[PDB]
């Protein structure tokens, strides 16, 4: 109580003493030093009866509130905390050891929480407010931040921070986790090596980026690969890799470098493969053009819960991408460009699997016909609640991309894998 009252009085005095805009104009170190000096002066003026440690703690709290992330700072610093959920200014939950717990942390009010959320989202050039209540982003340290504004979040601004996991999986791990059978792993190796235009669809948090990172491991080291991303997630191991990242528009609305611009430039950097960190806009069109004009092996990842939905989503993205084209034009462009679709999915038990490996066979009339080389069949459930299933090959001995395999001498391995998991 006494500490809280002293902190409130000191904050009010500081607010009445200086304007936050001036400090914001200053650097973090200079602003923090000035805030500490002003807080010490205010404490001396008020003759607050507290220890030097209490004064330092109050100064640190004031500095964090003015420019830091407020009460989240101790939680963000902590490593064991995997997730932080703030359901309004007065409810803060943290995930520790896989269990959600209610912390005593509290914000001053929904306005302070909204300011903190706006700071966090702007840290990556994103803006959240009444006009744009919802904002999802990925911070540079790899944590995912989701924010909803009061207009939608009835009980106050809602914030979710999912902190980055250190480790990253490999195809061997996926085989171990039963995400894909060994024959499926071999077929994926053939698909990646033989320069097949890939689309790695999947639901949110279903392993799209991890699967793409594993797939890139099959690219030949000699190939010049150009990776475009919004958050710099991939960790390709090849020597000749060019890592590009989009630049979101500044607060003035200028300086934007969308993924479409990155892909258009990539067409002029003499790459062999263009790897888009995630297709969500007009770049799809360009990417498909890249797939269909000599940049074979270009891989992208897409948000879709099934290959059919992935194809429909790609068609829509091309449609809204400025250019007005016939639906059949876009459909046959997709058919010509995309060779394989891999459906990463999350099961009802929360586990992750590679449900579909599918070929874009062709276009019949106005319907894109595809064939599933590999499908995951769920056959029940275990005693612990975990889903139970198995990956089975559809038995297609000659997939549409067989020629590509022949071009690289991988046709023998493709046949072996397709036969060994019938």
Ligand X SMILES: Nc1ncnc2c1ncn2[C@@H]1O[C@H](COP(=O)(O)OP(=O)(O)O)[C@@H](O)[C@H]1O
State the residues that interact with ligand X by CB under 6 A: 98, 169, 174, 177, 179, 202, 205-210, 352
251 contributes a contact to its own copies by CB under 8 A = yes
Q: Which is nearer to ligand ATP, 88 or 202 (CB)?
A: 202
Nearer to its own copies by Cβ, of 42 and 147: the residue is 147
Any binding-site annotation on 208? Answer: yes
> How many degrees, rounded to 5, is the angle at CA 286 between CA 313 and CA 264?
145
The CA distance from 300 to 199, in Å, is: 5
State which residue, 277 or 297, has the beta carbon closest to ligand ATP: 277
Nearer to ligand X, 186 or 352 (CB): 352
174 binds ligand ATP (CB under 6 A): yes
Least Å distance, CB 175 to ligand X, is 10
Show the tokens assigned to 161.
């921070």
Q: Do the annotations mark residue 170 as ligand-binding?
A: no
- The Cα–Cα gap between 353 and 180 comes to 7
Neighbour count for residue 262 (Cβ, 10 Å): 24
Helix (H, G, I), strand (E, B) or coil at 79: coil
Is 240 one of the binding residues for its own copies (CB under 8 A)? yes
Q: Which residue has the tokens 């053009």?
A: 289
Helix/strand/coil (H/E/C) assignment for every residue in 267-329: CCCCCCEEEEEEECCCHHHHHHHHHHCCCCCCEEEEECCCHHHHHHHHHHHHHHCCCCCCHHH
Ranges within 207-226 binding its own copies (CB under 8 A): 222, 224
Q: How far is the CB of 210 from ligand X (least distance, A)?
A: 4
For residue 246, say whether it is annotated as part of any ligand binding site. Answer: no
Residues 157-196 that bind Mg ion (CB under 5 A): none
User: Residue 220 region, left (φ>0) first, then alpha (ψ -120 to 50), else beta?
Assistant: beta
Q: Which is nearer to ligand ATP, 206 or 343 (CB)?
A: 206
Residue 195 beta carbon to its own copies: minimum distance, rounded to whole angstroms: 9
Alpha-carbon gap, residue 304 to 309, rounded angstroms: 6
The span of 26-34, 203-211, 214-222, 332-340 binding Mg ion (CB under 5 A) equals: 203-211
Q: Which of 165, 168, 406, 412 binds its own copies (CB under 8 A)?
A: 406
Contact 187, 204 (CB under 8 A): no
Q: What does 28 interact with, of Mg ion, ligand ATP, its own copies, none (CB < 5 to 8 A by kind)?
A: none
Q: Taking CB under 8 A as the rule, does residue 407 contact its own copies?
A: yes
Q: List b or e across 152-165, with b for residues whose CB sees 16 or more CB atoms inside 10 angstroms.
A: ebeebbbbbbbbee
Answer yes or no: are the C-beta atoms of 277 and 231 closer than 8 Å: yes
DSSP string, 151-211: TT-TTS-EEEEEPPPS----HHHHHHTTSS-HHHHHHHHHHHHTT--EEEEE-TTSSHHHH
Question: Was 214 annotated as part of a binding site?
Answer: no
Q: Is 138 labelled a binding residue?
A: yes
3 interacts with, out of its own copies, ligand X, ligand ATP, none, CB within 5 to 8 A per kind: none
CB of 419 to its own copies, least distance (A): 23
Q: Which residues contact 170 (CB under 8 A, 6 or more apart)?
A: 214, 217
Q: Which stretch binds ligand ATP (CB under 6 A): 68-76, 82-90, 207-215, 371-379?
A: 207-215
140 interface partner picked from ligand X, its own copies, Mg ion, none, CB below 5 to 8 A per type: none
Q: Report the residue number, 140 or 205, with the smaller CB distance to ligand ATP.
A: 205
CB of 162: closest distance to Mg ion in angstroms? 12
Binding flag, residue 118, Mg ion (CB under 5 A)? no
Closest residue to Mg ion, based on beta-carbon distance? 209
Other C-beta atoms lying within 10 Å of the C-beta of residue 270: 9
């Amino acid at each position: 109580d006494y500490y809280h009252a002293t902190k409130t009085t000191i904050f009010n005095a500081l607010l009445n003493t200086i304007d936050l805009s001036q400090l914001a104009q200053l650097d973090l170190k200079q602003a923090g030093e000035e805030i500490r000096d002003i807080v010490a002066e205010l404490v001396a003026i008020k003759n607050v009866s507290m220890s030097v440690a209490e004064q330092e703690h109050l100064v640190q709290d004031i500095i964090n509130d003015v420019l830091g992330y407020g009460p989240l700072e101790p939680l963000l610093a902590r490593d064991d905390i995997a997730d932080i959920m703030v359901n309004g200014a007065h409810r803060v939950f943290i995930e520790v050891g896989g269990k959600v717990q209610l912390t005593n942390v509290r914000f001053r009010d929904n306005l302070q929480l909204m300011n903190i959320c706006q700071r966090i989202v702007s840290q990556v050039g994103r803006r959240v407010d009444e006009s744009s209540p919802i904002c999802d982003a990925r911070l540079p340290d790899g944590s995912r931040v989701n924010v909803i504004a009061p207009p939608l979040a009835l009980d106050g601004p809602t914030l979710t921070i999912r902190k980055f996991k250190k480790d990253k999986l490999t195809m061997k791990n996926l085989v171990e986790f039963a995400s894909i059978s060994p024959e499926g792993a071999r077929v994926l190796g053939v698909i990646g090596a033989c320069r097949c235009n890939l689309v790695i669809s999947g639901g949110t948090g279903s392993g799209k980026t991890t699967l793409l990172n594993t797939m890139t491991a099959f690219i030949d080291p000699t190939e010049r690969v150009v990776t475009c991303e919004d958050a710099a997630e991939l960790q390709l191991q090849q020597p000749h890799v060019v890592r590009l990242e989009t630049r979101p528009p500044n607060l003035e609305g200028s300086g934007a470098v969308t993924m479409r611009d990155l892909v258009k430039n990539c067409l002029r950097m003499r790459p062999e493969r263009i790897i888009v960190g995630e297709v969500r806009g007009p770049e799809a069109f360009d990417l498909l053009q890249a797939m269909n004009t000599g940049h074979d092996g270009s891989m992208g990842t897409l948000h879709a819960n099934s290959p059919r939905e992935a194809i429909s989503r790609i068609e829509s993205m091309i449609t809204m991408g400025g250019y007005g084209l016939p639906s059949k034009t876009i459909k046959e462009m997709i058919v010509g460009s995309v060779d394989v679709i891999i459906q990463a999915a999350r099961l009802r038990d929360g586990s992750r699997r590679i449900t579909h490996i599918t070929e874009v066979v062709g276009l019949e009339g106005d319907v894109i016909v595809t064939q599933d080389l590999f499908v995951y069949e769920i056959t029940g459930e275990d005693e612990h609640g975990k889903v139970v299933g198995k990956h089975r090959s559809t038995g297609i001995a000659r997939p549409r991309f067989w020629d590509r395999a022949r071009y690289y001498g991988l046709e023998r391995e493709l046949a072996e894998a397709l036969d060994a998991a019938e």
